[PDB]
Design a protein around this ligand. Structure first.
Ligand SMILES: Cc1cc2nc3c(=O)[nH]c(=O)nc-3n(C[C@H](O)[C@H](O)[C@H](O)COP(=O)(O)O)c2cc1C
Ligand SMILES: Cc1cc2nc3c(=O)[nH]c(=O)nc-3n(C[C@H](O)[C@H](O)[C@H](O)COP(=O)(O)O)c2cc1C
Ligand code: NA
Ligand code: NA
Lengths: 140, 141
C-alpha cells in the first residue's frame, strides 16, 4: 500500500516514472521524472496533462494494456512487460509497475507508473511466463 | 518471495532487494534477489537468516541507520542514501528504500528493502540535501 514515500524513493533512485491524477479528465500525467523523459525522448511540455497511452503502438499486446486498464478501474497494483514506443517510433520492452496511492480515507488520489526498460532476450522469457499464466487462468 | 505486488515488481524488474520476517528473532532476511547477491558479493548461505546490518561499516553515517531503525519501529516507509559495504570490504552508496508490508488485518508481516547503487558525485548531492533537511527539521523540533 504505497504512499508519497514511494514517489520520493523513485525520484531519488533516478528511476523512470510518472504520476497521474485520476480526479482530472483522462487520468493524465501531472509529473514525469527526468529518467522517463530520457527513456521516451518526450519533453515534459509534450506529455504534462496527457494520458500515458501515447506509449502504445501497433505491436503493443492489447491483452497487456487490458490488464493495466482493469488494474486502474479496480485500484489494484500490478506489473506486466509490454512493448512501448518512443517519440521517434522506436520500440522498447517496458517491465511496468503501477501502484494506486490512497489517502487516509482509502480513496485513490494518484497512480504511479514505473517503467523499467529490459532486453529483448529477457522480455521473451517474461512475456512467455505471462502467456502461460494467461492460459492456466482461462482453464480455471 | 511473496504475492505482494511490489515484491513481484522488484523481482521481475531485476532489482536489488531483500525481504525480512519481523516475526523471527532480529528481523532476518528470508529472501534476497540475485541482483542483491551480485551488488554485495554475498552468496545466499552467508545472508539467509541474518539481519541486514552486515551491510554497514565504519564510514556508514549512524544518523542514516537511526532513521531506518525508527522507520522499522513505526512501520513507516522511507528512503535514505548511506554508505554500505560488500563482503570484500569495498564500499558503495546505497540509495535505499524500505517498505512495511501488511496483511488484511493491517499487521506488518514483512519488510522489503530496495538497494540502488548510485555514483559518488550523485550521493554527495543527496547526502547534502539530507544534511540540510536534518537542520531545517531541528529548527522546528
Ligand atoms: C500511472 C500510469 C502509468 C502508465 N504508464 C503506462 C506505460 O508505461 N505504458 C503503457 O502502455 N500504458 C501506460 N498506462 C496506461 C494508459 O495510460 C491507459 O490507462 C491504458 O491504455 C488503458 O486506457 P485506455 O483504454 O483509455 O487507453 C499508464 C497508466 C497510468 C495511470
Ligand atoms: C528489509 C530491510 C532491509 C534493510 N536493508 C538495509 C541496507 O540495505 N543497508 C543498511 O545499512 N541497513 C539495512 N537495513 C537495516 C538493518 O537491518 C537494521 O534495521 C539497522 O541497522 C538498525 O537496527 P540495529 O540498530 O539493530 O542494527 C535493512 C532492514 C530491513 C528490515
Ligand atoms: Na503512440
Ligand atoms: Na562485512
Amino acid at each position: 500500500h504505497m504512499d508519497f514515500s514511494f514517489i520520493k524513493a523513485l525520484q531519488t533512485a533516478q528511476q523512470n516514472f510518472v504520476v497521474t491524477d485520476p480526479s482530472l479528465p483522462d487520468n493524465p500525467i501531472v509529473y514525469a521524472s527526468q529518467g522517463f523523459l530520457n527513456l521516451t525522448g518526450y519533453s515534459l511540455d509534450q506529455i504534462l496533462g496527457r494520458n500515458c497511452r501515447f506509449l502504445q503502438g501497433p505491436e503493443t499486446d492489447p491483452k497487456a494494456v487490458e490488464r493495466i486498464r482493469k488494474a486502474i478501474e479496480q485500484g489494484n497494483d500490478m506489473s506486466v512487460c509490454l512493448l512501448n514506443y518512443r517519440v521517434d517510433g522506436t520500440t522498447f520492452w517496458n517491465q511496468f509497475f503501477i501502484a494506486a496511492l490512497r489517502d487516509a480515507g482509502g480513496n485513490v488520489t494518484n497512480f504511479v507508473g514505473w517503467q523499467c526498460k529490459v532486453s529483448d532476450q529477457y522480455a521473451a522469457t517474461v512475456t512467455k511466463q505471462q502467456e502461460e499464466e494467461e492460459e492456466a487462468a482461462a482453464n480455471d
